[PDB]
Amino acid sequence: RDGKLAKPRQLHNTLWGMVCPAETPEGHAVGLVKNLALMAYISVGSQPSPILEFLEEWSMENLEEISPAAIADATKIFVNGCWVGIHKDPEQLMNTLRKLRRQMDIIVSEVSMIRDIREREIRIYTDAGRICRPLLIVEKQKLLLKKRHIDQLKEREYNNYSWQDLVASGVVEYIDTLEEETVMLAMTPDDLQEKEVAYCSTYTHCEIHPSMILGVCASIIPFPDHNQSPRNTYQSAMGKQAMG
Amino acid sequence: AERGELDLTGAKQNTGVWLVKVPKYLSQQWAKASGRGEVGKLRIAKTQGRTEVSFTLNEDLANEHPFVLQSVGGQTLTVFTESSSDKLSLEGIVVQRAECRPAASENYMRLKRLQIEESSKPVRLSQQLDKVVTTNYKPVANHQYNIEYERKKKEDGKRARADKQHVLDMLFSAFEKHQYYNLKDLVDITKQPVVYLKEILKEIGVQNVKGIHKNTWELKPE
Amino acid sequence: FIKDDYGPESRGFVENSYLAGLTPTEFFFHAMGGREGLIDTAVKTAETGY
Amino acid sequence: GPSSQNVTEYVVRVPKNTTKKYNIMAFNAADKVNFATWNQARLERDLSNKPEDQPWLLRVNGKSGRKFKGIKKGGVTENTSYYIFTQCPDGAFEAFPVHNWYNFTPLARHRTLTAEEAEEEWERRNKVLNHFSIMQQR
Amino acid sequence: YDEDDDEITPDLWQEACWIVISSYFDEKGLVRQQLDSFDEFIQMSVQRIVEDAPPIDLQAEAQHASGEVEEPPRYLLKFEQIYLSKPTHWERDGAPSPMMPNEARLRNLTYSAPLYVDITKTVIKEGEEQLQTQHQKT
Amino acid sequence: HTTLRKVTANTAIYYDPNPQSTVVAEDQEWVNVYYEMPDFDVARISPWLLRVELDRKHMTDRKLTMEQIAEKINAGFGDDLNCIFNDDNAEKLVLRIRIMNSDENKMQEEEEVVDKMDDDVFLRCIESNMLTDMTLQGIEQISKVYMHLPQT
Amino acid sequence: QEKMATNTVYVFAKKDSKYAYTGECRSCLENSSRPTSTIWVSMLARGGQGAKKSAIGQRIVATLPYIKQEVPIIIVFRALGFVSDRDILEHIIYDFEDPEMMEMVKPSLDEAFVIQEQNVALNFIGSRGAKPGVTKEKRIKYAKEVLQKEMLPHVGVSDFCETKKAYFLGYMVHRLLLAALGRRELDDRDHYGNKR
RNA sequence: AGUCGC
């Protein structure tokens, strides 16, 4: 505060759909006071206990039971940054574990689960306070959500079907910023469709709508992309300033 | 021979034992089998360059578990026993470690989530309180206060200032155990009023303080 | 984007004009470039003052 | 034979209550322990420097034999159990509970460099300037 | 409704993602983050904290110089389930009634609710008694 | 400011107390090249061998000679640092270094005040100083950049 | 309120030209009592006193909570009781097949020689950390309780999980050595994945 | 204090 230039003021790359790009004050506090994205959500926190039980039962070997002089090949697994154990087949584990998340044996909004292949680590997070956003799931080079789910959403006008049911189909997922680093994320159904040799075909998530990266005040401003970027920031202050 | 000696007979036989990891629910079921004399049977089927091990539960106890073999090369596992007769013996070496795999990991989970729920239920915070009016009834005094009053109201209260000689004897008796005491202790052991115990201690004795007004009195030892 | 994409779009350079509109990614990278301009105004203002 | 085709099947028993506690004694494979060369051993709780919580002291053969330290594992299992499957003269299997898991590790017969003297002081002076002679002056 | 067999038309356009987005706000709503955290804070955390591990015991001093015949009395205090009543207000008369947020602003009140806890008193002195235990809701 | 550290590809320390039967049989003809080099006190010089390999590309740019480097290091350290070098007729360039002692006085009088650290360990301090402090044509401390420009 | 993520080690290149790299771990029971615990493992560089070994740029020390003086990581391992240098090497780097990692630690082993038992090492940490107390044994017991309670508390709070802490401390040295080889990226200051 | 104005 008051005399210190720094890089935690400049919009960082990871703030994509996590925190509004252009909604931070124009005064000395610029960029330090940020504003949450529209689709952004924040994990409320949960006990790690169930995950630990499923892992030990699946095939995770306990720390003091293994032999240290034989672990180089093995992948280290952590839960809330606590090093719980080791594994010799992380690919079947990750695939199975996610399947459980889609099926809700562990809480979606909660568990973040990340694999860092080049380091052979598996980090899992269930602590409070992580920023995450909903995305569509794509599978076998195409979207997993089908128009029949839409017809239930139209039906909601007189039925109990809801966004929670939509999460229960496992067609949408919650992704925190640490996990968002390791996904291959298509911009829009259109692009994921035309693709043949256009770019790649390995996508795993897709954006529910790209204009969601904006925070509350930035959404009032129409055609924000035909404006010079700081121009959008002055409007986010002034819109908040108007009366009515 | 002594209890500090470790019997090597088992080790001296070079006896091998098997090490199997099992889920708590299966062993809890065994735990409530008690002494039926069995919990199941183990089946081993061997082929060319391959071995299959499995377990079947007792049908009575149920009212196929495949085995996965494990490396033991990286640890020299052995077993010892601590007897109820306080005798120690080295029973054998682990020649194999293994894991008991469930018949199905997937559906099980329904039971498991329910299973987790049964051990794990602190149904907390949980139900507001709608409203309450128990900021407590107002008696005439605390119930226990009345108990305190009753105690005070039982014999003890006034003290026996009469008979200086017996009280003199009591001081002499104090002087029979130790050279000095705290005046707080002196009133406790004598059951007399402080002003009077002082009046006597001025007459036949002296005082000696230490540190921060910590005082002891003595019947002039000589 | 895909890992290691030095090609001009994944790393900076916007093709469109303010009239055509910026694609979503183009839009966000532009906001990064606009922020430098906002921050520099505040930091420079204090230092010259002194 | 077992090298070609074989099948075995043995009943598994659990006694209602064992007459003794069953414990695990684990060694590092790197220590390559061979009990073939053990002839005597003593095993007693280190307790004098301050019982069932206290570490193990393993003393093999005579005083000049190797000594090891046994450290207790926090619990046998945190969500499971460990059981021993044993062969019996009738031809059955017998299964025994684990009561404790202990880690056992090697100790030097006689090393002891000690820092109580002024080794810490020598460290203040330590410019990596000596190594053998300090071990000799001991 | 689905079966993934006779279906051949997965395509779905702008018109439809907004249906999905609407359902997100219909379910969650714009401020959810604040509310979900506070709710979890009551539903979990204030319970977790009194359900900690600091049951306090107190033993007054006895046999102060003399003594003999037992009893330096001993008391232990334990805490149980926590209750929270909907936000109430007490007039100077002493009579409580429900508050409503509009009232709370006009008259400048604080919009809070009263918290109660189960407490236990427990005497297992040195011998004469042990069961005399009483539950309170305070 | 070019330090020997910039030019050096790699270093190695060997125990080779018998040059006439060196630990690298392939290195053996260069020992044949040096036997007239103080043959009397090879019984006196230390048995530890330092061997260095140099990058041809750095050596070309700095347009140096192996005799320039050898003369630089010997001059810089002093007479103690006994140097010999490989033949220029190779794409690779390697330098072999031994240390000479104080000869006559080393007869172990009181206890040889050195506190008897191993001579190799002294050699690593030599190599350390040798990498960082040696300044072949590095006439000053201008970090290590130098950019030439043509101005029109 | 935005803060730095607890329970996870990240590597930094701060200003102080005498610290080459440092590994930071903020380790509170963000569900216990909310203290802090800020273990630092710092790699010292630039120097070497005299003819020490020509290049001090590998003398890895450790800050610990409520310790008045920096101590080398190896003492803490001695204090955990793993006197066996091969075992400490096993906790630090479970791939002793690479000569370069083995050389990187070696001068830190060289420092370790002055202290060669758990008790005395405990007496070192006690006196380097606390107020003066010629009691020796209490200095050892208090320090024993600090290692038990204060260091990496997220990994445990008792004797019965004292081994588990040893791997994790060792993992930080490993996580640090990787950066020091440079085959590992230096971790950003402001990545949102590392925020709460 | 913080918010905020240029």
Give the residue numbers spanning the domain of F71.
Answer: 1-133
D30/A69 CB distance under 8 A: yes
Is the minimum CB–CB distance between F124 and chain G shorter than 8 Å?
yes
Is the minimum CB–CB distance between D16 and chain B shorter than 8 Å?
yes
Residues near B133 by beta carbon (within 8 Å), at least 6 away in sequence? E96
What values do phi and psi take at B164, rounded to 5? -70, -35
The answer to whether D and B touch (≥3 CB pairs < 8 Å) is yes
Find out whether B166 is annotated in a ligand binding site. Answer: no
Number of domains in chain F: 1
Measured CA to CA, the distance from residue A80 to residue A178 in angstroms comes to: 13
B74/A105 CB distance under 8 A: no
Residues near F26 by beta carbon (within 8 Å), at least 6 away in sequence? none
Method: cryo-EM
Residues near A221 by beta carbon (within 8 Å), at least 6 away in sequence? A227, A232, A235, A236, A239
Exposure letters G168-195 (e unless 16+ CB within 10 A, then b): bbbbbbbbbbbbbeeebeebeebbbbbb
Beta bridge partners of E83: E116
Measured CA to CA, the distance from residue F1 to residue A69 in angstroms comes to: 46
Measured CA to CA, the distance from residue G151 to residue E74 in angstroms comes to: 35
Written as one letter, the residue type at A131 is I
Give the residue numbers spanning the domain of D126.
Answer: 1-138
Q: CB burial class (10 A; 0-12, 13-18, 19+) of residue D122?
A: middle
CB neighbours (10 Å) of residue E125?
15
Beta bridge partners of F94: F53
Residues near A153 by beta carbon (within 8 Å), at least 6 away in sequence? A161, A166, E19, E20, E23
Q: Report residue A22 as tokens.
A: 């252009």
Closest CA to G195 of A22, E36, A206, A34: A34
Is the minimum CB–CB distance between E60 and chain B shorter than 8 Å?
no
Nearest-Cα distance to chain F for G182, in Å, is: 19
Measured CA to CA, the distance from residue B100 to residue B53 in angstroms comes to: 10
For E8, name the nearest residue in chain A, comparing CA atoms only: A146
Terminal Cα distance for chain C, rounded: 44
Q: Find tokens 């061998």 and name the residue.
A: F49
In the complex, which subunits touch D with 3 or more CB pairs below 8 angstroms?
Answer: A, B, F, G
Nearest-Cα distance to chain E for A28, in Å, is: 27
CB neighbours (10 Å) of residue A59?
16
Measured CA to CA, the distance from residue E73 to residue E127 in angstroms comes to: 10
Residues near F64 by beta carbon (within 8 Å), at least 6 away in sequence? F7, F136, F137
CA of C25 to C1' of H4 (A): 32
B125/E42 CB distance under 8 A: yes
Whether F139 maps to a domain, the answer reads: no
Is the minimum CB–CB distance between C21 and chain A shorter than 8 Å?
yes
G163/A63 CB distance under 8 A: yes
Written as one letter, the residue type at E72 is P
Q: Tell me the resolution in Å.
A: 6.3
B109/A58 CB distance under 8 A: no
Strand order in the sheet with E115-122: E56-59, E74-84, E115-122, E133-137
Q: Strand H: which positions are within 7 A of a protein CB? A: 2-6
Query: Is-contact A9 A172, C-beta < 8 A?
Result: no
Nearest-Cα distance to chain D for G183, in Å, is: 30
Measured CA to CA, the distance from residue A86 to residue A122 in angstroms comes to: 9
Closest CA to A40 of G8, E138, E30: E30
DSSP 3-state of F116:
coil
Measured CA to CA, the distance from residue A169 to residue E63 in angstroms comes to: 72
Q: Find tokens 């939509």 and name the residue.
A: A166
For A11, name the nearest residue in chain G, comparing CA atoms only: G190
Q: Report residue G65 as tokens.
A: 């909570």
Sign of the torsion formed by the C-alpha atoms of F23, F27, F33 and F38: negative
> Chain A contacts of G6, Cβ < 8 Å?
81, 127
Q: Report which DSSP code applies to E16.
A: H
Measured CA to CA, the distance from residue E96 to residue F119 in angstroms comes to: 90
Query: Is-contact F56 F93, C-beta < 8 A?
Result: yes
Query: Is-contact E44 B89, C-beta < 8 A?
Result: no
Query: Is-contact G134 G49, C-beta < 8 A?
Result: no
Q: Report which DSSP code applies to A64.
A: G
Is the minimum CB–CB distance between D27 and chain B shorter than 8 Å?
yes
Q: Report residue B151 as tokens.
A: 């105690």
> Chain A contacts of B113, Cβ < 8 Å?
105
Whether F116 maps to a domain, the answer reads: yes
Written as one letter, the residue type at B54 is S
Query: Is-contact A80 G196, C-beta < 8 A?
Result: no
Q: Using CB atoms, which residue from A12, A81, A180 is nearest to G7? A: A81
Find out whether A92 is annotated in a ligand binding site. Answer: no
Query: Is-contact C41 A26, C-beta < 8 A?
Result: no
CB neighbours (10 Å) of residue A102?
18
Using only C-alpha atoms, chain C has a radius of gyration, in whole angstroms, of 15
Is the minimum CB–CB distance between A241 and chain C shorter than 8 Å?
no
Residues near A62 by beta carbon (within 8 Å), at least 6 away in sequence? A56, A85
DSSP 3-state of A40:
coil
Measured CA to CA, the distance from residue G76 to residue G162 in angstroms comes to: 12
Number of domains in chain D: 1
Q: Report residue F105 as tokens.
A: 């006085």
Sign of the torsion formed by the C-alpha atoms of F114, F117, F120 and F125: negative
Closest CA to B134 of E96, F38, A6: E96
What values do phi and psi take at G90, rounded to 5? -70, -40
Closest CA to A150 of E5, E20, E24: E20
DSSP 3-state of G140:
helix
B interface with E, Cβ–Cβ below 8 Å: 122, 124-134, 181-182, 184-185, 188-189
Q: Which nucleotide comes closest to A1 if you measure CA to C1'?
A: H2
Q: CB burial class (10 A; 0-12, 13-18, 19+) of residue F47?
A: middle
Helix (H) or strand (E) holding D122: helix D119-124
Exposure letters G67-106 (e unless 16+ CB within 10 A, then b): beeebbbbbbbbbbbbbbbebbbbbbbbeeeeeebeebbe
Measured CA to CA, the distance from residue B126 to residue B122 in angstroms comes to: 10
CATH number at residue F120: 3.30.1360.140
Q: What angle in degrees, to the nearest 10, is found between the helix axes of B183-190 and B194-204?
A: 110
Q: How far is CA E14 from the centre of its chain?
A: 45
Whether F24 maps to a domain, the answer reads: yes
Pairing of strands D41-45, A185-186: unpaired
CB neighbours (10 Å) of residue B201?
17
Closest CA to D105 of A64, B81, B3: A64
Written as one letter, the residue type at A68 is P
Measured CA to CA, the distance from residue G15 to residue B63 in angstroms comes to: 69
Instruction: Report CA-CA distances (Å) from D108 to D27, D65, E40.
Output: 15, 10, 55
Query: Is-contact A136 A145, C-beta < 8 A?
Result: yes
CA of A9 to C1' of H4 (A): 19
Query: Is-contact B93 B79, C-beta < 8 A?
Result: yes
Q: Which nucleotide comes closest to A25 if you measure CA to C1'?
A: H4
Q: Which residue is nearest to nucleotide H4 (CA to C1')?
A: A27
Measured CA to CA, the distance from residue B156 to residue G186 in angstroms comes to: 79
Closest CA to G86 of B74, A69, D26: A69
Measured CA to CA, the distance from residue A40 to residue A219 in angstroms comes to: 14
Q: Report residue E23 as tokens.
A: 């359902």
Instruction: Report CA-CA distances (Å) from A143 to A212, E16, F146, G69, G146.
Output: 19, 14, 56, 58, 54
Q: Could you give all domains of chain G from N- to C-terminal order, each with its CATH number? A: 10-196 (3.90.1110.10)
Query: Is-contact D103 D24, C-beta < 8 A?
Result: no
Closest CA to A214 of A186, A185, A239: A239
Q: Find tokens 């229960």 and name the residue.
A: A168
Q: Find tokens 């000679």 and name the residue.
A: F65
Nearest-Cα distance to chain B for D29, in Å, is: 5
Closest CA to A116 of G187, C22, D123: G187
DSSP 3-state of E7:
coil
E12/A148 CB distance under 8 A: no
